[PDB]
Amino acid sequence: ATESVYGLTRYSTNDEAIAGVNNESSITPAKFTVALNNVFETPYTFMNSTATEEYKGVIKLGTQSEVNSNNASVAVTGATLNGRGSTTSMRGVVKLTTTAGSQSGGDASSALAWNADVIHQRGGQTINGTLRINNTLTIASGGANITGTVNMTGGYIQGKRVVTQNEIDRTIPVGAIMMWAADSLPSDAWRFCHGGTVSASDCPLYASRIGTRYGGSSSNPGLPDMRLNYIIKVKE
Amino acid sequence: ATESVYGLTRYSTNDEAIAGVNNESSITPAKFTVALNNVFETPYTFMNSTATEEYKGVIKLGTQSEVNSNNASVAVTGATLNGRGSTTSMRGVVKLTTTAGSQSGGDASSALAWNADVIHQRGGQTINGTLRINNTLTIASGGANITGTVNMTGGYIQGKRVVTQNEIDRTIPVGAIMMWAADSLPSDAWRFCHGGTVSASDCPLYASRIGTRYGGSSSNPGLPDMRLNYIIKVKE
Amino acid sequence: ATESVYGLTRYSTNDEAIAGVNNESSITPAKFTVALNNVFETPYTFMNSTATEEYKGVIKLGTQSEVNSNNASVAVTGATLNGRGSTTSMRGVVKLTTTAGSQSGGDASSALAWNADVIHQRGGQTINGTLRINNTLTIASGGANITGTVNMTGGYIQGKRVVTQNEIDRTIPVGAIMMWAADSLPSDAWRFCHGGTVSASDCPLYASRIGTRYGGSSSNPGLPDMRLNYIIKVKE
Ligand SMILES: [Cl-]
Ligand SMILES: [Cl-]
Ligand SMILES: [Cl-]
Ligand SMILES: [Cl-]
Ligand SMILES: [Cl-]
Ligand SMILES: [Cl-]
């Protein structure tokens, strides 16, 4: 057999079926299935969102220095509120003192309490000690009740000069003689002119002014004897 | 035909082509294509980032108690600033009072204002009422102008004792007789010794001291008749 | 050859092997492998976590208005602490003043310092100027030492009336005559009754009361001549 004309043919072996180049034999069903098996089978807007008027946020604690400087941003604490003591130049917190002229527990930021021991303008109070006033005292009504001695440079009552003891002798001097209408004398400033003596120590002005003019001695100067009665002024 | 030698062959059927075990027939093109189709076709560093000096952050509101204790961490509010009232032991805020000795609206944390009604050391003021001083008053200049009566234990002007009315009789006692140079008397303390009487009620000391020595009666005691003129002192 | 019976066969061409419909030829190994190649080869709980008592958080800065209103939530700054000035109606911060009656640097929220120039109740102080008191002064001990003149409506020492100069003439009037025991006179209130004259300008009361009764002239009125000696009271 050939491609061209008919004739005899044998069957291919298994080896020929697999090695499919032999052109001189024919393929049986059994070697279609042999031959197939070589082919078929092979943190900024946190910290920048600050506290303000308008909006809430975050806040730095003021140092004392910042608190005292009136810093409009920082926070005031218990400690820096306490630490900002009032002074004469800076608004601040104070302790009260009820004793004028004393600080309260050594604190310079002490102010006088409502009930401090001051004298006020309404009256009815007591100063428990002395007082000095450097110019005129005017008492507008009700006078003065004074325990102890008043010393004054001058004195007038309703425009009339007050009399003092040194003036007594000018009005009626020791040594004056008058008469007397009664039986007894009410004071020893005067004595009867019935002779006898007075004591120079009892009557020092009589002794100096009159001496022994009427007898007696220097210690016991004599009185005039003028015997109504006469009387003589012997002492102040 | 065989594998070994040449000879006759028939063609396989379709069924034989598919069931490829028959070794005794040959495969045509038409049954290559039949047989193929059985094979080919089958929250900590929030809350721990706190407010401080140095750094901003977060803050607890102080209770009053913490504010008053000077807590250095918490925040002061309007309410706890207001609530921290000054006392004698603790720095704080105050109301002002212009009236010494009165709290302002019942507030114990009241301090005297700059213009409270106090007496100061500079002068020129008025106390509208009484004043008591428990020891010596010194007026250093300008004296005193006193409306009303001064009562004093003692009085001196420039070191001389002030005279009082009870001393008048010692100097010139009722009952004294002197002479007189003028035609009329300027006071009724003295009377002419021209007899007649005085009234005991007008002249009680004359009546007691002299009685009816010179005539008259107890109510109308007689004066001496000594007829310059004589005069007698009849009353203070 | 046929499907049914045996006989002669030729071999298929390559073209027949590929176009596998020819039923009248047989397939060689070489055209199994040709024919196969057409088949085988073809931001709320931030802002709502607020500051409180109990818990930390976030805070709004108080305006002054809120601070002053005692707002219990907002924050106090240096500026609003400073800005909350004490008044009589509102607790606040103060400046101190040591001068009563003056604000410190024009600040209405000025309180008297512990050492302000006030008079207190304990004594020992000085008012450097005048003082007016509108009712009675009581000095409880130690009297008064007064530089300058005291004018008073009335005066008593230990309940006895103080004597004034206008009373002198009532006790012993100008014009009185008495006797005298000494050789010389200690004052010119009295003169010897030895004739001669006094000066009307030296002795105006004698001149008015006595005139020229004893001789002389109106300018130089005569004294009595009564020639112990007589004396006459010529002036106060
Ligand atoms: Cl006698
Ligand atoms: Cl002698
Ligand atoms: Cl008469
Ligand atoms: Cl009688
Ligand atoms: Cl003479
Ligand atoms: Cl004449």
XYZ file of C-alpha atoms and ligand atoms in Angstrom:
714
model
C 0.000 0.000 0.000
C 0.902 3.659 -0.648
C -0.690 7.109 -0.385
C -1.332 6.902 -4.155
C -2.657 3.357 -4.833
C -4.253 0.496 -2.922
C -2.502 -2.696 -1.745
C -1.426 -4.698 1.314
C -0.662 -3.195 4.752
C 0.529 -4.500 8.143
C -0.270 -2.965 11.544
C 2.070 -0.583 13.341
C 3.694 -1.833 16.577
C 3.222 0.015 19.888
C 6.723 1.537 19.523
C 5.870 2.709 15.976
C 2.518 4.143 17.143
C 4.323 6.258 19.791
C 7.258 7.191 17.524
C 4.851 8.409 14.865
C 7.065 8.807 11.788
C 6.675 5.334 10.142
C 4.731 5.826 6.860
C 4.489 2.106 5.936
C 1.826 0.515 8.243
C -1.713 1.273 9.534
C -3.148 2.261 12.953
C -5.505 -0.057 14.809
C -7.947 1.107 17.547
C -5.639 -0.525 20.159
C -2.720 1.709 19.054
C -4.730 4.883 18.647
C -5.109 4.438 22.423
C -1.433 3.504 22.994
C -0.200 6.457 20.903
C -2.612 8.962 22.513
C -1.040 8.318 25.947
C 2.231 10.058 24.884
C 0.062 13.134 24.069
C -3.289 12.839 25.945
C -1.271 11.306 28.844
C 2.018 13.284 28.667
C -1.188 67.645 69.197
C -1.275 71.135 67.601
C -4.946 72.224 67.752
C -4.828 70.572 71.205
C -2.263 73.092 72.391
C -3.536 75.907 70.068
C -7.164 75.440 71.180
C -6.393 77.678 74.199
C -8.667 79.027 76.936
C -10.246 82.392 76.037
C -13.261 84.604 76.437
C -15.595 83.003 73.801
C -14.036 79.496 73.902
C -12.925 76.727 76.332
C -9.605 74.828 75.978
C -6.202 74.521 77.704
C -4.339 76.715 80.202
C -0.849 77.372 81.510
C -0.551 77.933 85.346
C 0.680 81.485 86.006
C 3.892 81.881 87.934
C 3.569 84.417 90.799
C 5.434 86.889 88.610
C 2.847 86.528 85.832
C -0.090 86.656 88.237
C 1.248 89.897 89.752
C 1.871 91.395 86.288
C -1.872 91.039 85.459
C -1.243 88.434 82.725
C -4.548 88.072 80.862
C -4.019 84.408 79.720
C -2.592 82.216 82.511
C -4.452 80.493 85.336
C -4.583 81.652 88.969
C -4.132 78.923 91.591
C -4.800 78.811 95.324
C -1.076 79.404 95.789
C -0.659 82.377 93.483
C -3.922 83.999 94.695
C -2.488 83.690 98.233
C 0.906 84.804 96.945
C -0.368 88.009 95.358
C -0.289 90.125 98.622
C -1.762 93.592 98.415
C 0.786 96.436 98.541
C 0.499 100.198 98.181
C 1.247 99.815 94.416
C -0.484 96.527 93.563
C -4.037 95.253 94.163
C -4.022 92.002 96.071
C -5.373 89.839 98.880
C -5.006 90.818 102.555
C -5.165 89.425 106.029
C -7.291 91.418 108.465
C -5.845 92.951 111.632
C -8.059 94.234 114.455
C -5.110 96.016 116.079
C -4.048 99.204 114.315
C -0.305 99.480 113.922
C 0.245 95.697 113.978
C 0.487 93.258 111.073
C -1.444 90.028 111.381
C 1.124 87.199 111.857
C 3.957 89.200 110.355
C 2.130 89.734 107.059
C 2.845 93.031 105.297
C -0.426 92.608 103.358
C -2.530 93.300 106.416
C -5.441 95.773 106.270
C -7.541 97.189 109.113
C -10.635 95.148 109.739
C -14.122 96.627 110.066
C -13.724 96.058 113.821
C -10.160 97.232 114.300
C -9.476 99.308 117.424
C -9.631 102.718 115.665
C -11.182 105.958 116.829
C -13.892 107.088 114.445
C -15.792 110.294 113.815
C -19.024 109.315 115.590
C -18.171 109.666 119.259
C -18.738 107.571 122.334
C -15.218 106.028 122.423
C -12.298 105.758 124.733
C -8.556 106.217 124.095
C -6.931 104.184 126.892
C -3.913 106.341 127.465
C -2.566 109.742 126.705
C -3.365 111.945 123.718
C -1.319 114.815 122.279
C -2.926 117.419 119.951
C -0.611 119.915 118.295
C -3.090 122.735 117.748
C -6.368 124.064 119.265
C -8.946 121.758 120.813
C -12.503 122.876 120.226
C -15.237 121.355 122.385
C -18.479 122.462 120.680
C -20.786 121.535 123.523
C -20.919 119.802 126.888
C -17.691 120.993 128.417
C -15.034 118.750 129.972
C -14.840 116.665 133.123
C -11.200 116.401 133.968
C -9.685 114.175 136.672
C -6.278 115.579 137.542
C -4.641 118.996 137.235
C -5.110 121.404 134.310
C -2.028 123.536 133.587
C -2.705 126.289 131.068
C -0.909 129.327 129.698
C -4.033 131.440 129.980
C -7.627 131.066 131.144
C -10.859 132.915 130.560
C -14.465 132.159 131.506
C -16.982 133.989 129.235
C -14.228 136.375 128.170
C -13.086 137.232 131.761
C -9.604 136.460 132.957
C -9.249 133.727 135.604
C -7.678 134.907 138.876
C -4.672 133.138 140.373
C -3.365 133.028 143.960
C -0.458 135.387 143.385
C -3.104 138.102 142.818
C -4.583 137.902 146.297
C -1.899 140.026 147.843
C -2.418 142.836 145.354
C -6.108 143.069 146.280
C -5.610 142.918 149.994
C -1.977 142.821 151.087
C -0.598 141.203 154.240
C -0.168 144.125 156.564
C -3.610 145.631 155.965
C -5.684 146.725 158.958
C -9.459 147.016 159.056
C -12.232 146.703 161.615
C -14.411 143.757 162.476
C -18.006 143.513 163.613
C -18.204 139.930 164.967
C -16.948 138.158 168.029
C -14.729 135.551 166.352
C -12.687 135.302 163.133
C -13.487 132.688 160.531
C -9.849 132.314 159.275
C -6.309 132.662 160.465
C -5.485 135.010 157.529
C -6.581 137.764 159.948
C -5.821 138.384 163.628
C -7.056 140.787 166.189
C -4.788 143.798 166.780
C -4.626 143.005 170.539
C -0.769 142.739 170.795
C 0.894 139.388 171.168
C 2.784 137.848 168.290
C 2.532 135.592 165.329
C 4.920 132.928 164.251
C 7.260 133.912 161.424
C 6.986 130.373 160.009
C 3.132 130.499 160.060
C 3.320 134.136 158.689
C 6.467 134.552 156.538
C 5.174 137.542 154.589
C 4.110 139.401 157.731
C 7.575 138.641 159.247
C 9.442 139.959 156.168
C 7.246 143.019 155.644
C 6.687 144.063 159.235
C 9.500 142.451 161.293
C 9.679 143.604 164.873
C 8.037 146.993 164.210
C 5.432 146.124 166.881
C 7.743 144.219 169.240
C 8.432 140.517 169.620
C 11.304 138.814 167.829
C 12.259 137.798 164.365
C 10.788 134.308 164.895
C 7.723 135.746 166.748
C 7.006 139.219 165.456
C 4.607 141.400 167.409
C 1.108 142.455 166.297
C -0.168 145.942 166.837
C -2.195 146.583 170.001
C -4.999 148.930 169.005
C -7.236 148.729 172.094
C -15.792 146.807 167.419
C -12.174 145.621 167.092
C -9.269 146.167 164.739
C -7.944 143.245 162.706
C -4.797 142.813 160.673
C -4.115 140.605 157.672
C -1.215 138.313 158.649
C -1.116 135.661 156.018
C -2.480 134.612 152.677
C -2.931 -8.323 8.183
C -0.822 -8.470 11.370
C 1.828 -6.409 13.169
C 4.432 -8.791 11.682
C 3.448 -9.309 8.002
C 1.347 -7.602 5.345
C -2.150 -8.654 4.201
C -5.812 -7.612 4.058
C -7.506 -5.230 6.531
C -11.030 -3.847 7.076
C -11.901 -0.484 8.653
C -12.819 -0.089 12.311
C -16.427 0.917 13.112
C -17.221 4.083 15.098
C -17.842 1.951 18.225
C -14.466 0.206 17.735
C -12.697 3.555 17.179
C -14.048 4.846 20.534
C -13.519 1.547 22.395
C -9.907 1.455 21.258
C -8.814 -2.103 22.081
C -9.606 -3.906 18.757
C -6.253 -4.927 17.173
C -7.724 -6.362 13.928
C -8.800 -3.370 11.728
C -7.413 0.023 10.573
C -8.299 3.672 11.361
C -9.667 5.961 8.666
C -9.513 9.803 8.830
C -13.288 9.823 9.578
C -12.730 7.699 12.726
C -9.606 9.474 13.899
C -12.087 12.353 14.288
C -14.834 10.184 15.857
C -12.384 8.601 18.328
C -10.738 11.934 19.259
C -14.092 13.266 20.547
C -14.026 10.827 23.532
C -10.619 12.381 24.433
C -10.317 15.819 22.723
C -14.072 16.258 23.450
C -14.441 14.509 26.852
C -6.828 59.441 77.164
C -3.720 59.196 79.403
C -1.346 61.926 78.139
C -4.578 63.954 77.805
C -5.137 63.796 81.546
C -1.368 63.615 82.389
C -0.541 66.632 80.191
C -1.540 68.886 83.131
C -1.361 72.665 83.536
C 1.974 73.852 84.983
C 4.521 76.619 85.031
C 6.428 75.802 81.767
C 3.530 74.012 79.998
C -0.199 74.386 79.122
C -2.744 71.534 79.506
C -5.723 70.535 81.691
C -6.960 71.699 85.103
C -9.151 70.577 87.977
C -11.419 73.315 89.553
C -10.372 73.882 93.179
C -12.973 73.325 95.846
C -13.153 76.240 98.339
C -11.237 74.063 100.782
C -8.384 73.610 98.292
C -8.379 77.272 97.284
C -8.113 78.316 100.948
C -5.335 75.766 101.593
C -3.146 77.473 98.924
C -3.243 74.440 96.591
C -0.618 75.112 93.911
C -2.302 73.040 91.104
C -6.080 73.616 90.951
C -7.965 76.437 89.249
C -9.538 79.449 90.984
C -13.036 80.395 89.804
C -15.151 83.510 90.270
C -16.958 81.610 93.019
C -13.951 80.398 94.975
C -12.145 83.769 94.628
C -15.299 85.348 96.119
C -15.519 82.512 98.635
C -11.991 82.963 99.963
C -12.872 85.808 102.467
C -9.972 87.455 104.231
C -9.656 86.616 107.944
C -7.078 87.465 110.589
C -5.273 84.153 109.778
C -5.793 83.831 106.016
C -5.149 86.229 103.110
C -8.281 86.807 101.092
C -10.668 89.181 99.344
C -12.622 91.861 101.241
C -15.576 94.146 100.951
C -14.901 97.771 101.863
C -16.744 99.526 104.690
C -16.688 103.314 105.101
C -18.151 103.045 108.607
C -15.687 101.867 111.242
C -17.142 99.253 113.540
C -19.670 98.009 110.957
C -19.367 95.140 108.482
C -20.494 95.804 104.940
C -23.738 93.808 104.377
C -23.020 91.395 107.194
C -19.692 90.299 105.708
C -16.991 89.372 108.225
C -14.370 89.953 105.499
C -14.866 93.695 105.577
C -11.869 96.063 105.749
C -11.806 99.825 106.335
C -11.858 101.758 103.111
C -9.459 104.595 102.300
C -12.388 106.931 103.041
C -13.783 105.285 106.149
C -14.901 107.632 108.939
C -11.701 107.291 111.035
C -9.771 109.931 112.923
C -6.234 110.211 111.612
C -3.004 111.759 112.818
C -3.097 114.879 110.623
C -5.659 117.088 112.319
C -8.567 119.171 111.148
C -11.284 116.601 112.035
C -14.375 116.345 114.114
C -15.565 113.597 116.492
C -19.353 114.090 116.578
C -19.961 113.105 120.149
C -18.153 112.528 123.367
C -14.557 111.410 123.847
C -12.976 109.760 126.892
C -9.163 109.738 127.376
C -7.797 107.666 130.235
C -4.558 109.551 130.826
C -3.110 113.081 130.321
C -4.164 115.289 127.427
C -1.359 117.417 126.066
C -2.264 120.363 123.841
C 1.091 121.472 122.373
C -0.115 124.790 121.028
C -3.212 126.895 120.463
C -5.100 126.234 123.653
C -8.734 125.110 123.866
C -12.064 126.764 123.166
C -14.574 124.981 125.301
C -18.361 125.429 125.150
C -19.794 124.226 128.442
C -18.410 123.797 131.957
C -14.898 122.563 132.803
C -14.725 120.589 136.064
C -11.165 119.868 137.157
C -9.406 118.470 140.204
C -6.788 121.197 140.082
C -5.956 124.254 137.989
C -2.886 126.354 137.382
C -2.134 129.166 134.933
C 1.644 129.577 134.302
C 2.349 127.626 137.482
C -0.011 129.718 139.716
C -2.964 128.168 141.455
C -6.433 129.192 140.222
C -8.613 130.857 142.876
C -12.105 129.585 143.644
C -15.111 131.329 145.229
C -14.811 129.630 148.600
C -11.538 131.582 149.007
C -13.136 135.010 148.868
C -14.217 134.939 152.464
C -10.722 134.154 153.701
C -9.335 137.248 151.961
C -12.042 139.593 153.073
C -14.609 138.037 155.395
C -18.258 139.049 155.748
C -18.242 141.184 158.840
C -15.259 143.325 157.842
C -15.493 147.099 158.231
C -13.501 149.660 156.277
C -13.933 153.220 155.063
C -15.123 154.516 151.735
C -14.197 157.586 149.735
C -17.063 157.814 147.196
C -20.683 158.800 147.336
C -22.248 155.517 146.195
C -21.360 151.807 146.383
C -20.834 149.782 143.242
C -22.067 146.445 144.759
C -24.388 145.130 147.395
C -21.549 143.046 148.946
C -20.932 146.185 151.043
C -23.295 148.528 152.894
C -22.903 151.774 154.674
C -22.647 151.494 158.471
C -25.592 153.928 158.903
C -27.835 151.578 161.014
C -30.868 149.959 159.493
C -30.879 146.275 158.681
C -30.185 143.727 156.045
C -32.252 140.757 155.111
C -31.039 137.445 156.523
C -32.074 135.718 153.274
C -30.110 138.255 151.135
C -27.196 138.034 153.705
C -27.150 134.556 155.320
C -23.509 134.704 156.380
C -23.892 138.129 157.987
C -27.034 136.825 159.806
C -25.228 133.714 161.135
C -22.004 135.494 162.083
C -23.404 138.721 163.469
C -27.066 138.020 164.386
C -28.764 140.793 166.286
C -25.534 142.198 167.774
C -26.448 145.595 166.257
C -30.224 145.361 166.732
C -32.981 144.284 164.374
C -34.270 140.722 164.284
C -33.131 137.340 163.183
C -34.782 137.807 159.765
C -33.591 141.472 159.553
C -30.373 141.847 161.488
C -29.143 145.342 162.264
C -26.069 147.035 160.754
C -23.732 149.104 162.837
C -24.364 152.862 162.947
C -20.952 154.512 162.870
C -21.925 158.142 162.189
C -15.799 159.748 154.531
C -18.092 156.900 155.645
C -17.719 153.462 157.168
C -18.796 150.415 155.173
C -19.324 146.814 156.164
C -19.043 143.650 154.100
C -22.458 141.939 154.271
C -22.383 139.308 151.618
C -20.186 137.493 149.169
C -11.571 -2.544 2.116
C -14.743 -1.613 4.038
C -16.005 -1.494 7.630
C -17.753 -4.830 6.937
C -15.217 -7.004 5.033
C -11.472 -7.170 4.453
C -9.614 -6.022 1.311
C -7.084 -3.525 -0.059
C -6.421 -0.053 1.415
C -4.199 2.940 0.563
C -2.798 5.474 3.048
C -4.443 8.820 3.740
C -2.563 11.962 2.612
C -1.578 14.695 5.094
C -4.514 16.842 3.875
C -6.909 13.893 4.376
C -5.473 13.182 7.853
C -6.183 16.805 8.908
C -9.569 17.007 7.141
C -10.699 13.844 8.891
C -13.856 12.865 6.991
C -12.397 10.511 4.298
C -13.658 6.959 5.067
C -11.695 5.187 2.282
C -8.000 5.014 3.408
C -5.966 4.122 6.544
C -3.887 6.162 9.041
C -0.143 5.641 9.328
C 1.928 6.609 12.424
C 3.347 9.576 10.424
C -0.185 10.985 9.907
C -1.452 10.275 13.396
C 1.226 12.857 14.268
C 0.323 15.222 11.386
C -3.404 15.060 12.219
C -2.865 15.505 15.987
C -1.232 18.918 15.383
C -4.600 20.445 14.293
C -5.964 19.302 17.708
C -3.007 18.712 20.106
C -1.340 21.754 18.436
C -4.352 24.034 17.730
C -13.909 66.827 69.553
C -17.032 66.404 71.743
C -15.810 64.637 74.916
C -12.795 66.964 74.511
C -14.996 70.004 75.007
C -17.520 68.159 77.280
C -14.762 66.774 79.536
C -14.818 70.108 81.435
C -12.949 71.219 84.558
C -14.841 70.429 87.786
C -14.520 69.514 91.420
C -13.868 65.717 91.079
C -12.342 65.845 87.559
C -9.704 67.689 85.449
C -10.351 68.895 81.860
C -10.845 72.146 79.902
C -11.722 75.707 80.940
C -13.120 78.924 79.521
C -11.389 82.197 80.707
C -13.893 84.304 82.672
C -14.623 87.773 81.398
C -14.415 90.420 84.172
C -18.206 90.433 84.227
C -18.306 86.683 84.914
C -15.518 86.849 87.488
C -17.378 89.601 89.374
C -20.670 87.662 89.191
C -19.058 84.740 91.112
C -19.299 82.358 88.125
C -18.505 78.893 89.500
C -17.089 77.419 86.209
C -14.768 79.869 84.409
C -11.088 80.534 85.056
C -9.644 83.545 86.900
C -6.591 85.161 85.290
C -4.006 87.622 86.578
C -5.973 90.311 84.750
C -9.431 89.509 86.064
C -8.135 88.930 89.632
C -6.587 92.424 89.386
C -9.745 93.696 87.705
C -12.089 92.514 90.448
C -11.578 95.600 92.761
C -13.185 95.432 96.171
C -16.205 97.724 96.645
C -18.681 98.205 99.473
C -21.006 95.644 97.767
C -18.535 93.160 96.264
C -15.596 91.226 97.756
C -12.407 91.906 95.865
C -8.708 92.748 95.862
C -7.372 96.040 97.268
C -4.373 98.284 97.234
C -3.166 99.409 100.656
C -3.021 103.079 101.648
C -1.091 104.274 104.707
C -2.755 107.696 104.531
C -6.357 107.743 105.726
C -8.630 109.703 103.440
C -6.450 109.137 100.351
C -6.704 106.435 97.689
C -3.492 104.744 96.650
C -2.684 105.920 93.074
C -6.255 106.915 92.342
C -7.610 103.432 93.064
C -11.107 103.305 94.561
C -10.335 99.787 95.851
C -7.944 101.083 98.469
C -8.160 99.873 102.088
C -6.360 101.185 105.176
C -3.143 99.350 105.824
C -2.159 97.923 109.208
C 0.198 100.914 109.488
C -2.053 103.662 108.189
C -1.900 106.986 110.052
C -5.033 106.377 112.186
C -5.654 107.165 115.827
C -6.418 104.015 117.776
C -7.891 103.205 121.161
C -4.616 102.438 122.960
C -3.124 105.856 123.597
C 0.296 107.380 123.211
C -0.421 109.132 119.866
C -0.356 112.561 118.389
C -2.889 114.375 116.174
C -0.766 116.986 114.365
C -3.318 119.729 114.153
C -6.612 120.770 115.575
C -9.368 118.540 116.933
C -13.068 119.337 117.352
C -15.292 117.240 119.683
C -19.014 117.935 119.603
C -19.901 116.754 123.098
C -18.232 116.330 126.539
C -14.565 115.444 126.898
C -13.849 113.182 129.833
C -10.250 112.869 131.016
C -10.337 109.926 133.460
C -6.932 110.539 134.976
C -3.792 112.630 134.650
C -5.272 115.996 133.843
C -4.253 118.201 130.908
C -1.175 120.232 130.064
C -2.330 122.953 127.762
C -0.082 125.380 125.859
C -2.173 128.395 124.926
C -5.357 129.960 126.290
C -8.373 128.022 127.602
C -11.698 129.796 127.003
C -14.595 128.134 128.801
C -18.236 128.879 129.519
C -17.866 127.786 133.120
C -15.153 126.484 135.436
C -15.066 124.594 138.696
C -12.231 123.023 140.685
C -13.473 120.246 143.049
C -16.997 121.627 142.758
C -16.018 125.279 143.559
C -16.563 128.053 141.078
C -13.445 129.630 139.532
C -13.075 133.367 140.215
C -12.568 135.849 137.388
C -11.056 139.357 137.380
C -14.353 141.198 137.096
C -15.102 139.879 140.615
C -12.206 141.646 142.293
C -14.002 144.937 142.515
C -16.996 143.405 144.262
C -14.763 142.013 147.020
C -12.747 145.133 147.530
C -13.860 148.083 145.417
C -11.671 150.926 144.157
C -12.400 153.691 146.595
C -11.997 151.582 149.736
C -9.916 152.945 152.610
C -8.161 150.879 155.256
C -5.083 151.151 157.443
C -1.606 149.811 156.908
C 1.008 148.520 159.313
C 4.192 148.565 157.175
C 6.487 151.228 155.858
C 6.071 150.592 152.122
C 3.332 149.245 149.826
C 3.887 146.124 147.777
C 1.578 147.196 144.866
C 0.283 150.275 143.161
C -3.345 149.072 143.602
C -3.150 150.975 146.915
C -1.779 154.412 147.810
C -1.207 156.256 150.993
C -3.921 158.785 151.885
C -1.301 161.585 152.154
C -2.906 163.978 149.565
C -1.371 164.416 146.161
C -3.008 162.923 143.106
C -3.166 159.934 140.879
C -3.280 159.847 137.145
C -6.729 159.280 135.654
C -5.151 157.155 132.897
C -3.279 154.966 135.461
C -6.503 154.914 137.641
C -9.595 155.202 135.391
C -12.002 153.678 137.899
C -10.828 155.936 140.723
C -11.186 158.951 138.342
C -14.758 157.994 137.332
C -15.928 157.057 140.827
C -14.222 159.757 142.850
C -13.391 162.597 140.402
C -12.130 165.749 142.031
C -13.868 165.110 145.377
C -10.452 165.429 147.081
C -9.008 168.135 144.816
C -6.759 167.919 141.780
C -8.147 167.802 138.257
C -9.995 165.438 136.034
C -6.717 164.125 134.568
C -5.027 164.111 138.037
C -7.647 163.550 140.694
C -6.707 164.188 144.304
C -6.285 161.539 147.024
C -7.567 162.067 150.511
C -5.119 163.478 153.070
C -5.805 161.643 156.315
C -2.756 162.665 158.376
C 0.015 153.568 161.257
C -1.221 155.144 158.003
C -4.395 155.166 155.952
C -4.371 153.654 152.468
C -6.852 153.825 149.632
C -7.530 151.365 146.833
C -6.938 153.254 143.562
C -6.826 150.628 140.905
C -7.423 146.992 140.169
Cl -6.826 136.292 166.629
Cl 15.347 138.653 167.063
Cl -25.935 150.839 151.451
Cl -35.893 137.535 166.326
Cl 1.815 155.623 147.688
Cl -10.508 169.541 135.366
